[PDB]
Amino acid sequence: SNATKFGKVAVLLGGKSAERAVSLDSGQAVLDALLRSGVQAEAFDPQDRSVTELVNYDRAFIVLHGRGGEDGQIQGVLEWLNIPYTGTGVQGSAIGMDKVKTKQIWQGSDLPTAPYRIITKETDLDSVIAELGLPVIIKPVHEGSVGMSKVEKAEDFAAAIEKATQHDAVVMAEKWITGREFTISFLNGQPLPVIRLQYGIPCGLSETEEKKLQALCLRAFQAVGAEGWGRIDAMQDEQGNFWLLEVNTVPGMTSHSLVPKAAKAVGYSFDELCVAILEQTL
Amino acid sequence: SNATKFGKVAVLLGGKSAERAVSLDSGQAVLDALLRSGVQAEAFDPQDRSVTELVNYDRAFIVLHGRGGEDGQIQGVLEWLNIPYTGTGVQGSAIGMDKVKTKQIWQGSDLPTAPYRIITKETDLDSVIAELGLPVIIKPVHEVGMSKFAAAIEKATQHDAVVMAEKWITGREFTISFLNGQPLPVIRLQYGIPCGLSETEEKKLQALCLRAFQAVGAEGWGRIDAMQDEQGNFWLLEVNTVPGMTSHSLVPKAAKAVGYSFDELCVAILEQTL
């Protein structure tokens, strides 16, 4: 029985980040699903309950989005307490929360990703323009979809850099590539059917283009050290090339989120998906 | 004052890793220094203590070497307990414990580092030997345990079942220590101040190592090792986010060379936490 198999599970939800509200929604949905499945799940909100009280549990299902939950901190405590848990470890999480460090890992593994430049007051805006070309996208390095602005002149720059400066002291200008954006979800370390972003299955890629994108994303997922489940975002350009965008090591499990979509396209109810995520902890 | 200013401080020492002995040594020295300077420091060894006790301190001086203190685990627990602490945060520490991820990020920031292949059992060497060139230096990714290859691969798998082979290079090994984010005088190794490096080649290496230190997310204090080859080009080797503070340790050398007693070093490191 699932009560035996998993013992006491803590569903880690809410937390201290900007994304707390989304995390409460993921958490509730995951809790209800695990309970329907006969697992002994309990909400654990580390904003209200000391993380030392995790010692009362046999394992953790992490659905804390953003700062605290996705950046290696909560995984740090879980390692320290010797409690197994879902998703990526400390290293991968802390890399995955940083767009530039993720891309350097990707540049460093012979995987395609768009040129970029870190931009911090001191940097010269015409040395950026001449190297990258127009247009570019300005994004906060650490938010791990907020603060983004599209820059198509010298004029567009100064307003975009203060969009991102709210969310981050450190900001990257990345070369714009024209095309369509996709998300590739992961379950038990492997790629699930791709989803075009903006519904989005069918995604608009030939069987061939798709399985090639999934292979590429598998390697991106491994490179950065992600485990279990998560999403890689990618671009296809108007000449057919793929470009890796970013990694997400604790995706949404809200009723509008994309990983449930992709898991359902291959047989998983939402409750089955939740058991399968938790099975990584055995 | 100082008793007032820093409050109750926990010296994180000892622990459960292979480097425990060295940590105990670093820990006893830091505790002694802090206590001489009037700060209310107390030893906190995780082997004898409960995590729930960290909440009794206003700040922590981390001198836990290896697994636990150097890979972000303890940093994670302190972030969540809201305990300010010395040195590098979760990310920098997690990356710094890993020679390849560190070198990857360095490649990616256009900083010099020697070629390498990851090399585990069930891969053929002739791919590696062809690509890097003999001679070559195997080493565990996540920690010495080194050598200079059918048998040397299992000496690494003692420590870590993933190993890296690095293009060996002829030259002089250095280490460049950091305090309050800024680099300190450099030290040759196999004394080592003077290092044997012109004032001008010294500032070049420091400003480079500063960038390598920054690029990896490291903060406050630490060490970057580097090499200079026969033609005078520096190659970065690795980063260390919780260096020794034993009586033979390099960071105390480097800081004495610029006017810090061991005791003023310790206080200066603790000042990162305000």
Curated annotation (Swiss-Prot), chain B:
PANTHER family (UniProt xref):
D-ALANINE--D-ALANINE LIGASE, D-ALANINE--D-ALANINE LIGASE B
- GO biological process terms, semicolon-separated: cell wall organization; peptidoglycan biosynthetic process; regulation of cell shape
- For the ligand (ATP), the binding residues are 129-175
Q: Which cofactor does it need?
A: Mg(2+); Mn(2+)
Name the chemical reaction catalysed here: 2 D-alanine + ATP = D-alanyl-D-alanine + ADP + phosphate + H(+)
Iron found in the keyword field: no
Q: What class of enzyme is it?
A: ligase
Where, subcellularly, is it found?
Answer: Cytoplasm
Q: What is its EC number?
A: 6.3.2.4
Q: Which UniProt keywords apply?
A: ATP-binding, Cell shape, Cell wall biogenesis/degradation, Cytoplasm, Ligase, Magnesium, Manganese, Metal-binding, Nucleotide-binding, Peptidoglycan synthesis
Domain of life of the native organism: Bacteria
UniProt-recorded name of the protein: D-alanine--D-alanine ligase
Question: What Gene Ontology cellular component terms go with this record?
Answer: cytosol
* UniProt family annotation: Belongs to the D-alanine--D-alanine ligase family.
| Entry binding sites for Mg(2+) 2 | 238, 240
This entry's comment on the bound cofactor is: Binds 2 magnesium or manganese ions per subunit.
Question: Pathway, per UniProt?
Answer: Cell wall biogenesis; peptidoglycan biosynthesis
* PROSITE patterns per the UniProt record, alphabetical: ATP_GRASP, DALA_DALA_LIGASE_1, DALA_DALA_LIGASE_2
Q: Which residues cross the membrane?
A: none
Protein residues bound to Mg(2+) 1: 225, 238
Role description: Cell wall formation.
What GO molecular function annotations does the UniProt record carry, in alphabetical order? ATP binding; D-alanine-D-alanine ligase activity; metal ion binding
